[PDB]
Amino acid sequence: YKPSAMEQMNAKNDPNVIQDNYRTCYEVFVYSFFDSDGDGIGDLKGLTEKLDYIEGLGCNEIWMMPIMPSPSYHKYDITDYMNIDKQYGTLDDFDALITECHKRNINVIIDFVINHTSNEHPWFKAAADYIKSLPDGAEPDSSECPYVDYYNFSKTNTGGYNQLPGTNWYYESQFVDSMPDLNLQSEAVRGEIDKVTSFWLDRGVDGFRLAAVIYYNNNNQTETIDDLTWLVNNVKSKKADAYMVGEGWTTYREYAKYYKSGIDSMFNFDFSQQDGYIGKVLNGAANHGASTYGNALVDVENEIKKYTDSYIDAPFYTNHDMGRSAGYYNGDNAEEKTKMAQAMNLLMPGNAFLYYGEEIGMRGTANDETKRLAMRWSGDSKAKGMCVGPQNAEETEQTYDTLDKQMEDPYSIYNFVKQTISIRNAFPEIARGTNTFEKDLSNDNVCIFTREYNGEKAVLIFNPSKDEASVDVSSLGVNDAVAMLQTTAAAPSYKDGTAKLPAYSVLVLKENLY
Numbered sequence: 001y002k003p004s005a006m007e008q009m010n011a012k013n014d015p016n017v018i019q020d021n022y023r024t025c026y027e028v029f030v031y032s033f034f035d036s037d038g039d040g041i042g043d044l045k046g047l048t049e050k051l052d053y054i055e056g057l058g059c060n061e062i063w064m065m066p067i068m069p070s071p072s073y074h075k076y077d078i079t080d081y082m083n084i085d086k087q088y089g090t091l092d093d094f095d096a097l098i099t100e101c102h103k104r105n106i107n108v109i110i111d112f113v114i115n116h117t118s119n120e121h122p123w124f125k126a127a128a129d130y131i132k133s134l135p136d137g138a139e140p141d142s143s144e145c146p147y148v149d150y151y152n153f154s155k156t157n158t159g160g161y162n163q164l165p166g167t168n169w170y171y172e173s174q175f176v177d178s179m180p181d182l183n184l185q186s187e188a189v190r191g192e193i194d195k196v197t198s199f200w201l202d203r204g205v206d207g208f209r210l211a212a213v214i215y216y217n218n219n220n221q222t223e224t225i226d227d228l229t230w231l232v233n234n235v236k237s238k239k240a241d242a243y244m245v246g247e248g249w250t251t252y253r254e255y256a257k258y259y260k261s262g263i264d265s266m267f268n269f270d271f272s273q274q275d276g277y278i279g280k281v282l283n284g285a286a287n288h289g290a291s292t293y294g295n296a297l298v299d300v301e302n303e304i305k306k307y308t309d310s311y312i313d314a315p316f317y318t319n320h321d322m323g324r325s326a327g328y329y330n331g332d333n334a335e336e337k338t339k340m341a342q343a344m345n346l347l348m349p350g351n352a353f354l355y356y357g358e359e360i361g362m363r364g365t366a367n368d369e370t371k372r373l374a375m376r377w378s379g380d381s382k383a384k385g386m387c388v389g390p391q392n393a394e395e396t397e398q399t400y401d402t403l404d405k406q407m408e409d410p411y412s413i414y415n416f417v418k419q420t421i422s423i424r425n426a427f428p429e430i431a432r433g434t435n436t437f438e439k440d441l442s443n444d445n446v447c448i449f450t451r452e453y454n455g456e457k458a459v460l461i462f463n464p465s466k467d468e469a470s471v472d473v474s475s476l477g478v479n480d481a482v483a484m485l486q487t488t489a490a491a492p493s494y495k496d497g498t499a500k501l502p503a504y505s506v507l508v509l510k511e512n513l514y
């Protein structure tokens with residue numbers, strides 16, 4: 001193994017990992033990750049066995065997709081909020097995972113799905129049976145069945161209601177009939193969620209990913225923010241440094257608003273997907289090339305600032321609900337783009353997220369199942385712990401090698417992402433600093449930022465273009481080049497205030513201030 005120039009350069013910078021809520025988070029689908037008992041389904045024991053891998057990648061947080069009992073493979077429709085799904089193992093396996101995570105200073109985030117339950121959840125079964133029991137006269141009585149007010153039942157088909165089979169009643173189920181929506185205005189419901197947050201916090205959970213936060217109270221954004229506020233306070237009441245990140249799948253003008261709840265993070269969705277800011281810039285669909293990435297960072301930061309001066313952005317770029325990054329880039333320098341997309345994701349301010357498999361450029365988009373294929377550990381047929389993945393996934397042609405092979409390749413996507421995360425772990429200002437887009441020095445080819453945290457300043461220079469570019473950054477002050485990312489043998493250079501970046505590369509400087 002012969003290390004690239006970037007590897008040698010970046011290694012000379014000491015890790016500076018701060019134990020707070022600005023981390024690098026690996027999002028795992030337990031189902032498709034690593035199988036410990038040989039049934040082809042991934043499990044908690046399997047995840048535990050692969051913590052050396054995740055830690056070696058440089059991630060110091062894990063978010064698992066839902067781990068509680070569910071009739072589906074994906075497990076977003078929950079039947080029991082205080083156990084583990086039998087396919088994943090037991091509560092004892094969860095306890096061991098937490099212990100092993102904390103020993104490695106890795107924090108654990110669980111997917112917290114309270115906008116709906118499964119229609120097989122006992123609360124709904126009981127409400128449904130009760131509703132069906134009522135004579136024509138009717139009008140439910142929550143003293144006879146309190147669960148009737150845990151969900152929204154009506155004789156009227158408003159928006160997102162489905163029929164309760166064999167009756168004249170309907171119930172709210174925005175996503176699908178098998179996912180009835182919880183009434184989060186119910187004090188009884190809030191009482192139940194209280195017990196649930198106590199349960200998971202008491203087993204050493206560090207935070208929550210809040211699913212579907214903008215659908216907490218259907219179309220009523222006021223009640224939704226009230227609901228989120230209640231939840232954020234319920235959690236922080238019990239553990240002050242508990243971390244919470246909300247999924248608000250919408251534009252930034254909308255998801256900025258949810259920061260009024262006091263939540264730490266909202267996922268930064270306008271930077272996600274093929275047609276998000278990162279994707280558009282790399283595929284040449286942006287009005288101002290590289291500088292569009294600058295403008296977008298500033299516009300979103302400025303929007304959030306309307307609501308809070310005290311937050312952690314959640315850049316993620318891709319997740320289990322979207323086509324994998326590698327599928328966004330085809331033809332000439334697709335690999336270069338695939339790498340740089342993750343530089344543009346992971347070197348953003350706040351708490352950065354990496355979806356499992358993105359570090360080896362896994363492909364898959366045709367349907368949701370196909371976005372959640374088995375982690376490609378190895379090419380070997382019968383390697384221990386390989387997962388079969390979801391049963392209804394479409395055919396998908398991969399374009400990059402398996403992980404074992406990528407580790408051995410100094411110019412693999414894996415080694416690039418690994419290098420990216422090392423830069424982030426070396427310079428706390430990248431995640432925590434105030435962000436300044438140096439617009440006067442940026443153009444369609446290069447994008448320049450200064451990051452300032454507690455009197456330390458760094459300069460980030462991205463070249464997400466197919467063209468070599470030079471920039472005079474001497475106006476920013478006296479700088480030293482400390483880190484870089486290269487997508488080919490061509491490496492960034494820096495001399496006497498002039499930076500030269502080849503196509504698809506990054507250069508990091510420290511400013512010296514006297």
Ligand SMILES: OC[C@H]1O[C@H](O[C@H]2[C@H](O)[C@@H](O)[C@@H](O[C@H]3[C@H](O)[C@@H](O)[C@H](O)O[C@@H]3CO)O[C@@H]2CO)[C@H](O)[C@@H](O)[C@@H]1O
Nearest residue numbers: 074076077113175176210211212247320321367368369
């Ligand atoms: O029935 C209509 C839709 O059904 C399918 O969508 C599934 C998703 O595959 C599944 O992951 C889950 O979506 C959750 C999503 O992953 C999560 O990030 C978000 O916070 O909550 C979602 C709901 O819990 O559930 C839906 C609904 O069953 C199908 O793939 C989709 O194309 C259909 O439109």
Ligand SMILES: [Ca+2]
Nearest residue numbers: 035037041043
């Ligand atoms: Ca298994």
